[PDB]
């Protein structure tokens, strides 16, 4: 504290030596500076300009360029002041080139030597589009090998940068002259902590190949740190490679000070190095993915992994830099910051702790007043990317964002002309100041979606194998009907087996005959009057209890689905959380809708409008979302005051039994929920036709749904109501890939949309409609990514997709595949495992047109039709050419085309620039019309009303010429 | 006027001084009534409970009723205030004592005895007969004869009465000038169907009885005052007075009441004085402020009429002083009775009269017997000439009169309350109310530029212009008869050669025109036109679509009486029924326009950053609209305009017999400039094109209102998805009802009876909401049906263009034959109670018919007849009443008259109809106030006129956008952020 004030005074003074000894982006004479100036003045313009730079390299024709310019910036008149094609192209390309050292290896190597003669060391990084295949990972890997080979032939002629002593052939007498950095996920297109070991090994195998070449020339390899999703994978890759070459000192890892985890990660890493008696090198950065991590975490209800006050990152940096410097004997340090306070702190801290100069250096990005830094510090290394202008454009966008952020130390230092005292402030003080400077109903928290499984966590990774094993000790049970609170066995048993291993029998399911169905309907009807008269808030409370019951069994409930229906780990967990979401959301919806509301405002009169349940609801559930959709339909019916007779799909009957367990744990009154699995040919029509049924909730095939709708319309003798239908049926969903689509995003999202859970989703992409000029490029990357994926048992997280639901689904899907192969041409058909299991290959077929059967009929399996549209008008026309309208997707960065799709691509759920599956409660209420449904949307604010009928009570309040005056009366 | 105002104030000060601090009994804290009023004034919940209890009290005729109501209104013994079966006794006795305080007797001989006591104490009297509402000719006769009996008793007594002492004049007269016998009569008690809709009939019926009473009054040289009732009858009552006055221009002792709280009163008073001068007669005016203040304000607000009363209390006071001065200035033509308990008012009158030197025989003072006691005695001491208003008769109307007195005394603005409960400052109490007005006057939301929704003003037959408009517009319609009406498809007229005439149900020989029928070809053409028009209409901005409805609404509004007259002739709507039909259509247009504007903006859903979800609605396509004849403009416009504003295009089939009304949709939408093909008009034979229209693959939605049989058929057929059919067809359906009104033991029969009569027989009972079953509790059954049947007997059946008829012919020949057969069925099941005469000659007349002895197992307790046939069902207890109400397959509307909080609660919960009405008729639902529709066999749970309705015509869509590019996303206002 007393000492703290003294050192801070030394840091501040050093800060001014840098300011005394002291960019293009803030120079308002150049076109770039004027564009950034207006960007920092106008946020609307900033958004347009940055998005334009992002899409710019896809603007490959005069038409694409001209139209996008108009669409982002308006006409040549309403634009800002600062031939539109020529002025923008040359400038943007000029801005991009300022940050790269070359587009070829020979140019980069030539430029690197010029840098050396100016006294700058370098670390070289290879620019590239995201790796989406093995071939792309190999190209990336070979580029480093090629670079290293070039440098190998040159470095012998390089004099070492001048130092105070040591080896005049080494930089500053100690640093290796060749220094490269590699992006780990660029070495493996399927890097994913869900398959942690597989990812580590695949990345590590390529990294080792590069490292060996690096060691051959006694160079340095730094392993870059990417997004939080891959942080643990990356640390483990570094740890393994280090120990494989425990004696080689020139291996480095990046750590990010903006991570709450980093204090611990750095402590652990230092302890690990000590334990193994190795040395390490750390490049400490603040972090490149701030906005992305914040958004990502908030989208999945995860804890935000980054500090959210900017000074907290600065304070963390100075704190973690001190820790490394304290540990200089084992940990070499690279300070990687452009912040003069941060740099000045590191310099005085190294002085305070008497750290030798060969234990720390300073690094900055090429293109971002370097000389002034080099004069005070002396040991400066430029981060020097080289490669293609396409990824160079995306890199530029990053630099523009970085330099023009409100919290950017650079923007504050120039563009704002800030007080130097505030700039060189101890960020710990800033932190405390910033911290100092800083709705549900009925007493319940507001709704929030349940947190998604998070495989960055060791415990979540370990949980699945544990619970799959625990579920396996519980196999072989016989499951009874559940009627009026009693278990009811019958003599008709149907086995439920593992679709990935059909010899594994999970249990036996009793089947309800018509007598048993009639009993359950009778039970539901008898329970109805009391349940109807139960207060809506009380009914909602059972759903809340069921939700907690489920939340407590999350991994166990997931594991059942992995085995019974072949859900992948993530897919299984998402099914359970969606069930939880329905329970939480429908509970709140009933509370909201449960209070009678006064309508009209005439005095002497009270009108109250409110809702009543219908009676007995038949709920006929699908197997593809066996807990989520079952629970959603059933809980909606129940919470609105109806009583339910529930028929799970046969092959997911055990998941259906989970509803019994959950409502039982919640203490739901007897007969409000009854469980009657049964054979459709025996009791399907009976259930639908029955006169005591007032409502039918169905999700499944169009054919079955349409039949139900037809039969339910009949009013039989003794039937009290016209039957209400709540039906969600299938889709034939298209994703459109526009000319300007970002293919790094489009390809994996399309792959997931088509083959996630074997394509067994009503929302699945079964048609990808690709614009003529981007067709060949798109399919090549899509097929190459597909080839990298593996088909097999869903319990093994290394597999992308596995077996389809059952034998019948397999035969039907395979027939469709053959039909499609006669209509189009096969682009990819995966291997499948030998032996048992209902495996259908991951299948992609091109040459498909709207007249083809597989362009029209829902296959409900891993068969993707690729269709080539001649222009955007045809793409939309083709998207709209089926009898379905459930979901749709479009990858496009054209405001005009997006506007057209929003208007004309009329599906129930249209997605823009992301996959078209995985709808979430409240955020994406799900459902459509045409042959896809009856316009009901589960998980939305209109849904509960479908399960009820409105009532009005009107009271004349006037007696003997007087009436009470009510609040909202129109009076005098 | 400073000098006079100072004399008035000093006069008021002497008045208060001479009162000596005495409180009227109602403000006596030492008395039970005072304690009850004190607590009522401190606690509004109690006031409401206590006053409603006093209102229901005379119906609590058994010990169980009494005990239960006491518990339901006041809670258990330890829930009650201190000043409150033994409980049954102290309560009953105190309430009865309170009521007796305001009444001079129960029998004529008792009233007479007590009048003599009053004279001994120096008070004159005006006698008025207490009675329940007159609901029949028999009841009007009993009321009339009560006065005749009273007059005969007073004729024998008056000769022996010494005249009250005065300063001069005739020693045989009161104060030397006033006749000793003075009675007041309530005009509407003389005619149960008094209604300005039948203005001439109402005046004559009332005048004829008033004349009989008046001749007897004149026979003993007495005074008759005609009381003034609610605003609805004010013009009728004025006309009755004027005519009776002119019949006996030479008889001086005839008075009329005028009400200072009416904005009309300055003009009315002026007109009456001018009229009196013109005819060279004299008059007498009792000026009051007015008895019906809350009622008039509520009634006007409920009908979007201008409130006829001032709404700042001091305005009524200021009006009184102004109008009293005018009368006094005109003392030569106008005798004055100051009727007020307000000391400022009284003082004002006294000083103005002195300032104008008005002879004392030209003005007297009047107060209500049994209240404002010290004011009464103060008037006696200072003015000398004071007349007590003296009600007499049965305790049942005696209790309703008491409730009114309690209300009058305990009002926040009551002079009596402020003087005697609140200890208000004398200077404030006595200030010029004109000053009060200025000080109160100075001390005193829609969306998107549009004013909020309000229901169109109902036709108001208190106005001479509204009364005169109908015969005029009917005559004008008659010049338009004989046209041929074609189909209207894609903006063009299409003629077919199959023509069906449309005629006047009350005079079938009158042919209103000929209607072209669409075959399947033309219906297919209309569907093709709607479908071609759909894409551009769908893409039209919702606000722009709403604007077309707003223009149609204005077009309708400017043609209101015209459109109304067409309905009177084509389908036999009564004047009010016709107008209400057109206003309801206007309401739909205004309401659905606003609803589309509300629903037309996409809403962000969720709050995750980097993501925008917008939820919004899209139309379905071509809507078939199949409309009924019974609300030929209203329901048609409602269903069609809802489909239109939500972005669908409409193929519209009106009912045959109301096709011309259907053509009004063409006129209105074309006047609004609606794009071609958005609305198509295709009347046709159901047996030719009905199924075709419903079966058609390009239909996506069907809106139907009508019979259960047709509705269910449509539902079944529409469920099928045919080749080329784009959507699962959406059904919006309003079907029949078999609606019951329950009459509980404690029901107020004065309200229940006329409300049941209207619910059952308004528009000949041709409403889905109509009461067709009245379920009456055992103990009140005989009295209820006697009054109901007797009221029915007074009504006339005949042509709806004649406003004197209650109801007229039914829709057409088929309806007449169907209903008549049901009546015969019902007469074999139960027992006929009433079967009205009907006119001789042409017309589809069915007698107004009432049948008792009906049980749930009977056909006419189950099947919708849709005509003037009412089943009366006798329930043994309230549980059975509810059970019987719920014993049909329908659940559309229902009613209950009851004043039991427990029974009303049971009804709210278990009487599960779409629209349940408490203490009023179960018909005439208004847009927004009563969204209309039911489930069971009455419908599919859609409610026209309410905020869930438009959604049934659309399907929701969500657009989800990932807004993140290259690691950055715009931050939006409602994002969950940091
Ligand atoms: C059958 C009937 C009878 N009538 C009469 C008679 C006599 C002799 C007398 C005395 C009475 C009568 N009536 C009743 C009346 O009307 C009453 O009473 C009065 O009105 C009372 O008053 P006063 O007393 O002067 O007192 P106050 O407190 O002052 O006053 C009250 C009044 O006012 C008004 N309001 C209230 N509130 C308000 C008002 N206005 C405006 N605003 C507001 N907010 C009212 O009016 C009250 O009441 C009668 C008669 C006849 O015939 N008719 C009638 O109508 N009535």
């Amino acid at each position: 504290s007393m000492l703290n004030s003294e050192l801070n005074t030394k840091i501040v003074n050093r800060g001014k030596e840098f300011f005394g000894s002291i960019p293009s982006l803030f120079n308002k004479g150049a076109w770039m500076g004027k564009a950034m100036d207006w960007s920092m003045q106008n946020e609307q313009f900033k958004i347009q300009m940055f998005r334009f730079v992002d899409v710019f390299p896809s603007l490959t024709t005069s038409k694409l360029l001209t139209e996008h310019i108009r669409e982002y910036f308006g006409n040549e008149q309403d634009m800002p002041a600062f031939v539109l094609n020529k002025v923008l192209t040359s400038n943007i390309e000029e801005m991009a080139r300022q940050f790269i050292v070359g587009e070829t290896t020979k140019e980069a190597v030539k430029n690197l030597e010029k840098l050396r003669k100016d006294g700058f060391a370098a670390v070289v990084d290879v620019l590239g589009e995201a790796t989406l295949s093995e071939e792309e990972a190999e190209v990336y890997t070979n580029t480093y090998l090629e670079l290293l080979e070039a440098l190998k032939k040159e470095q012998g002629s390089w004099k070492g940068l001048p130092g105070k002593g040591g080896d005049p052939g080494l930089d500053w007498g100690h640093a290796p002259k060749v220094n490269i950095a590699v992006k780990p996920t660029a070495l493996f297109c399927l890097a994913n902590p869900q398959d942690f070991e597989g990812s580590v090994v695949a990345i590590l195998d390529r990294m080792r190949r590069i490292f060996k070449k690096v060691m051959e020339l006694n160079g340095f390899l730094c392993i870059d740190m990417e997004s939080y999703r891959h942080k643990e994978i990356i640390l483990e890759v570094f740890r393994r490679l280090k120990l494989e070459y425990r004696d080689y000192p020139h291996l480095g890892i990046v750590l990010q000070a903006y991570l709450k985890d980093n204090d611990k990660d750095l402590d652990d890493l230092l302890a690990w190095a000590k334990e193994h008696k190795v040395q390490i090198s750390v490049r400490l950065v603040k972090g490149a993915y701030w906005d992305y991590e914040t958004v990502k975490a908030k989208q999945n209800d995860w804890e935000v992994p980054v500090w959210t006050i900017k000074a907290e990152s600065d304070a963390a940096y100075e704190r973690q830099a001190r820790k490394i410097l304290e540990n200089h004997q084992i940990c070499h340090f690279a300070c990687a910051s452009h912040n003069i306070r941060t740099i000045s702190a590191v310099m005085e801290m190294a002085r305070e702790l008497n750290v030798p100069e060969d234990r720390y250096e300073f690094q900055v990005l090429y293109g971002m007043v370097r000389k002034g830094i080099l004069k005070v510090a002396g040991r400066i290394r430029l981060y020097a990317p080289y490669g293609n202008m396409v990824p160079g454009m995306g890199y530029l966008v990053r630099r523009l964002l970085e330099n023009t952020a409100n919290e950017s130390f650079l923007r504050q230092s120039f563009a704002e002309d800030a007080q130097i005292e505030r700039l060189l402030e101890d960020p710990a003080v800033t932190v405390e100041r910033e911290r100092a400077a800083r709705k549900g109903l009925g007493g319940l928290p507001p709704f929030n979606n349940e947190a998604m499984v998070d495989f960055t966590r060791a415990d979540h990774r370990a949980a699945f194998p544990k619970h799959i094993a625990q579920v396996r000790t519980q196999l072989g049970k016989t499951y009874p009907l559940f009627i009026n609170g009693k278990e009811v066995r019958t003599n008709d048993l149907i086995p439920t087996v593992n679709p990935n291993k059909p010899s594994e029998v999970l249990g036996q399911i009793c089947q309800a005959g018509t007598t048993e169905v009639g009993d359950a309907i009778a039970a539901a009807k008898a329970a109805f009057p009391a349940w109807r008269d139960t207060d809506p808030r009380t009914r909602a409370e059972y759903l809340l209890k069921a939700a907690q019951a489920a939340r407590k069994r999350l991994f166990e409930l997931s594991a059942w689905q992995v085995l019974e229906i072949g859900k992948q780990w993530d897919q299984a967990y998402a099914d359970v959380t969606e069930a939880i979401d329905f329970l939480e959301y429908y509970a709140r919806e009933m509370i909201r809708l449960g209070q009678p509301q006064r309508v009209g405002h005439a005095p002497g009169e009270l009108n109250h409008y409110f809702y009543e349940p219908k009676g007995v609801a038949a709920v006929i559930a699908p197997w593809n979302f066996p807990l989520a959709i079952s629970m959603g339909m059933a809980s909606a019916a129940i919470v609105t005051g109806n009583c339910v007779v529930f028929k799970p799909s046969g092959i997911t009957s055990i998941i259906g039994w989970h509803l019994v367990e959950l409502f039982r744990e919640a203490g739901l009154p007897e007969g409000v929920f009854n469980f009657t699995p049964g054979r459709g040919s025996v009791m399907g029509d009976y259930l639908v036709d029955h006169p005591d049924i007032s409502l039918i909730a169905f999700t499944g095939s169009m054919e079955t749904g349409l039949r139900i709708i037809e039969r339910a319309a009949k009013v039989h003798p003794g039937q009290a109501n016209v039957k209400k239908i709540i039906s969600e049926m299938g889709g034939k969903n298209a994703i459109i890939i526009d000319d300007d689509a970002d293919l790094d995003e489009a390809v994996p999202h399309v792959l997931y949309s088509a083959f996630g859970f074997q394509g067994q989703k009503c929302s699945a992409c079964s048609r990808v409609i690709v614009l003529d000029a981007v067709y060949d490029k798109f399919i090549e990357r899509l097929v190459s990514m597909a080839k990298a994926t593996k088909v097999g048992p869903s319990e093994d997280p290394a597999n992308y997709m596995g077996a389809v639901a059952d034998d019948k689904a397999m035969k039907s899907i395979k027939e469709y595949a053959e039909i499609g192969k006669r209509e189009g041409h096969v682009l990819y058909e995966s291997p499948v495992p030998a032996g048992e299991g209902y495996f259908v290959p991951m299948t992609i077929i091109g040459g498909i047109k709207p007249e083809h059967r597989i362009a029209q009929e829902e296959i409900f399996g891993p068969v993707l039709a690729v269709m080539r549209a001649k222009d955007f008008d045809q793409a939309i026309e083709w998207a709209n050419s089926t009898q379905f309208a459930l979901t749709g997707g479009i990858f496009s960065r054209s405001p005009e085309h997006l506007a057209k799709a929003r208007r004309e691509f009329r599906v129930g759920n249209l997605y823009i620039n992301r996959n078209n599956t995985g709808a979430l409660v409240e955020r994406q209420p799900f459902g459509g019309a045409r042959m896809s449904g009856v316009g009901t949307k589960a998980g939305g604010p209109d849904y509960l009303l479908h399960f009820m009928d409105p009532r009005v009570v009107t009271e004349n309040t006037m007696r003997r010429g007087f009436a009470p005056i009510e609040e909202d009366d129109d009076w005098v």
Side-chain angles (χ1 to χ4, degrees), chain A residues 36 72 178 247 327 347-348 383 386 448 464 648 686 909:
Chain A
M36 292 305 104
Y72 277 89
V178 174
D247 294 324
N327 278 285
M347 290 188 65
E348 291 306 309
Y383 179 87
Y386 88 105
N448 259 112
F464 268 93
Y686 181 90
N909 292 82

Side-chain angles (χ1 to χ4, degrees), chain A residues 714-759:
Chain A
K714 179 55 181 174
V715 181
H716 301 274
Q719 181 176 324
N721 294 297
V722 173
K723 288 172 188 170
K724 175 61 173 168
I725 296 300
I726 292 135
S727 199
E728 180 192 307
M729 307 175 267
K732 189 72 189 182
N733 314 301
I735 291 166
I736 296 178
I737 309 299
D738 199 4
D739 293 294
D740 72 351
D742 184 333
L743 304 187
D744 286 357
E745 308 276 359
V747 167
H749 277 286
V750 169
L751 193 69
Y752 175 66
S753 293
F755 305 118
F757 187 51
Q758 299 69 260

Side-chain angles (χ1 to χ4, degrees), chain A residues 460-475:
Chain A
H460 283 200
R461 296 197 295 273
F464 268 93
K466 174 224 221 293
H467 280 89
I468 289 162
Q470 290 178 187
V471 167
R472 272 181 171 132
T473 71
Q474 320 178 41
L475 301 190

Side-chain angles (χ1 to χ4, degrees), chain A residues 573-594 596-599:
Chain A
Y573 197 98
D575 199 271
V576 181
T577 64
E578 177 181 348
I580 288 166
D581 289 347
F582 278 139
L583 289 172
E584 295 285 355
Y585 180 73
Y586 295 152
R588 289 162 170 79
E589 281 294 280
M590 188 65 251
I591 288 160
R592 182 179 66 89
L593 296 159
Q597 297 296 318
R598 181 176 178 184
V599 297

Side-chain angles (χ1 to χ4, degrees), chain A residues 8 12-13 15-16 19 341 409 418 420 423-427 429-430 433:
Chain A
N8 200 65
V12 165
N13 297 330
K16 308 168 173 178
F19 281 115
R341 164 63 197 204
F409 175 90
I420 194 190
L423 283 173
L424 300 177
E425 190 183 46
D426 189 324
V429 167
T430 313
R433 193 168 52 231

Side-chain angles (χ1 to χ4, degrees), chain A residues 58 224 435 558 622 676 720 733 739 797 818 890 906 925 946:
Chain A
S58 289
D224 290 318
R435 284 177 175 180
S558 299
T676 60
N733 314 301
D739 293 294
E818 291 306 312
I890 171 175
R906 286 178 160 100
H946 286 287

Side-chain angles (χ1 to χ4, degrees), chain A residues 14-21 23-26 29-31:
Chain A
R14 173 77 56 169
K16 308 168 173 178
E17 182 184 0
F18 273 107
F19 281 115
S21 179
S24 315
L25 198 140
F26 309 108
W31 193 96

